[PDB]
């Protein structure tokens, strides 16, 4: 409603770096807000795509940002009569970024890994890796839980059970308020998908450079399964956290699985031990129900609510014809220990191939009326197909069915305006929470400041 679409702030990165693929707000130790931006196709030292991360200070003018530097050199270690190998070419550093406290977690879902022992090998596979940084102190650390040293022959004998070679860890990410990093890995367990959790503080204390393979005892991974309903389900494509079991000492995890059960798609709510509390099933096949998940209390009853994006949902229309527009599902949490029922509200796109629901960002309370609000992206929507971001306001019964404000892309065609979103943070310190929108196709980020209500 009260975002300012006239005076925007534009940050920009190198041409072809996909600057804006991921973003988040980062507060330093003094509470000063900045913007962390991922660019998964930034060039490295060898003039080869490796990805990169930028830390943008808040300026109303915008402009260029300084790099948040990471090691981009392929590593090699000959230990234990084996040879460990990391490969950072086309790893996609910055395909997901997230901030917690004064720490930044940027991930390279496609960092490759291989282990050589004489003539055998573990196979060169994308285990992924996340780089952690404390910008004020310069501390650095890494976390790659799916790295293994088991040779290729062994996996074949055991029928590819507990195969973490293609995790792509860091594909999606989130950090609990307590400081436990949770990585979605949609390729883990031979493309079933797994989650990996570990406290940030233990990642730093247990990491040393050049080791490549090290233990993090406090870490916790999800479990493999022989159920074909999970096969090729990409469990971990998106991740989120919230309070869904009425126990405030426990933290619950929300996981998207957009090809679960033969591309029906699903979202599951679990405890910190990966025991399934509830499962939302997709409405339509190939709709990619689970592509994005968001957790926020929209109806102001203190109980978190769930939002699921199905960006390829095909709405039924006249003459038995379908039209791919995208859809968002809202689930309100019931009072006390009870199952989440049917969706409370269905938001359906309008523009063909617009992918309404590709990203869903909690905004906090935008108009300051006591109800938290959200923003939904349609990166190829709008009458021109350049992209749109729609704002839906909270209310006592859930969300409003019609948007309060529509942000049309200020970028050219193909910018993927809205592919990444992030809100609920007041960056200019005017009392109103603001919205940052990524457009990796144009290598830019647009900042929308919220202003008093008119």
């Amino acid at each position: 409603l009260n975002l300012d679409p006239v005076q925007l702030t534009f940050y920009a990165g190198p041409n072809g770096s996909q600057f804006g693929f991921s973003l988040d707000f980062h507060k330093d130790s003094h509470g000063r807000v900045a913007i962390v931006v991922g660019a998964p196709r930034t060039l490295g030292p060898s003039q080869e795509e490796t990805g990169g991360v930028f830390l943008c200070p808040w300026r109303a003018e915008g402009g260029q940002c300084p790099s948040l530097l990471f090691d981009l050199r392929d590593e090699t270690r000959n230990v234990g009569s084996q040879t460990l190998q990391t490969f950072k070419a086309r790893q996609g550093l910055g395909a997901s970024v997230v901030s917690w406290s004064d720490v930044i977690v940027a991930c390279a879902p496609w960092q490759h890994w291989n282990v050589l022992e004489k003539t055998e090998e573990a196979e060169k596979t994308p285990v992924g890796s996340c780089f952690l940084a404390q910008p004020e102190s310069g501390r650095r650390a890494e976390y790659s839980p799916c790295r293994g040293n088991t040779l290729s022959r062994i996996y074949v004998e055991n029928d590819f059970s507990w195969d973490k070679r293609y995790c792509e860890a860091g594909f999606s990410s989130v950090v609990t308020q307590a400081g436990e990093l949770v990585l979605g890995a949609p390729g883990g367990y031979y493309f079933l998908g797994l989650l990996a959790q570990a406290p940030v503080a233990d990642i730093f204390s247990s990491y040393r450079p050049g080791i490549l393979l090290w233990h993090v005892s406090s870490q916790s991974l999800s479990f493999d399964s022989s159920n074909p309903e999970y096969f090729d389900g990409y469990w971990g494509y998106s991740v989120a956290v919230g309070e869904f079991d009425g126990d405030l000492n426990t933290t619950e995890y929300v996981v998207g699985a957009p090809t679960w059960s033969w591309t029906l798609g699903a979202v599951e709510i679990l405890d910190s031990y990966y025991q399934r509390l509830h499962r939302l099933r997709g409405e339509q096949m190939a709709s990619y129900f689970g592509h994005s998940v968001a957790v926020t209390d929209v109806n102001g009853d203190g109980r978190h609510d769930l939002l699921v994006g199905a960006p390829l949902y095909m709405e039924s229309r006249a003459d038995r014809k379908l039209a791919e527009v995208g859809r968002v599902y809202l689930f309100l949490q019931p009072r006390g220990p009870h199952a989440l029922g049917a969706p409370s509200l269905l938001l359906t796109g309008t523009q063909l191939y617009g992918r309404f629901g590709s990203a869903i960002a909690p905004l906090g309370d935008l108009d300051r009326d006591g109800y938290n609000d959200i923003a939904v992206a349609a990166p190829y929507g709008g009458p021109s197909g350049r992209g749109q971001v729609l704002v839906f306001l909270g209310q006592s019964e859930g969300l409003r069915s019609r948007p309060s404000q529509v942000l049309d892309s200020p970028f050219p065609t193909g910018s993927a305006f809205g592919f990444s979103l992030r809100g609920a943070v007041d960056i200019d310190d005017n009392g109103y929470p603001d919205l940052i929108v990524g457009a990796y196709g144009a290598n830019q980020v647009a900042v929308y400041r919220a202003q008093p209500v008119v």
Partner: antibody
Amino acid sequence: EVQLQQSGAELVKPGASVKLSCTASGFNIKDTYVHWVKQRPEQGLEWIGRIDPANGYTKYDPKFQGKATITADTSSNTAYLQLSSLTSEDTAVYYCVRPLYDYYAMDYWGQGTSVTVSS
Amino acid sequence: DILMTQSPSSMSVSLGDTVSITCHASQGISSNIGWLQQKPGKSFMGLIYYGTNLVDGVPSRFSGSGSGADYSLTISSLDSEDFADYYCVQYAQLPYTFGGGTKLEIKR
């Protein structure tokens, strides 16, 4: 805290067999590699072998191929070292070892099991 | 197998001295070496791993260094507890092999 609690000292005769144990305390034995080391005053320290208790796969020094047999039961959270056809040279102290962070290191050590072979 | 030549076999030193133990390998091991301490009539405690990294709980007066096939363990300002046995161990290749050992003795 990480502590490795081994069995009590053994006193056996030559030709017989003995099975030492190494119980994990404060952690799961399945987490890391578990090595066995042999110590003697003259010969010093010698590496026997290792086992991954998550799957049971083992590696050995070719010198101990035959006498040493390393196993692990995740249920009782314990790792074992069996020695067969015992000899006066098998009189030594035996330590089970695990690493701290590095997958291939030797950082945490049990108190050690004293073995004495004699007729 | 890789031979670990540890030297010296023993040294007589006093409290507060800065001493250095060395360990030479038959081939390059690229910092895949650890250091160990065995106090008299007791078990082993890890000091260093990967050539330089301290084990948790170890004081900072200890320090490891070296590269290729020649490494070192240094103790700045000896304490009364530091008089004990010290061993190096390489884990670059299987089988793991240890050094002969070094015993720090009180000088008088």
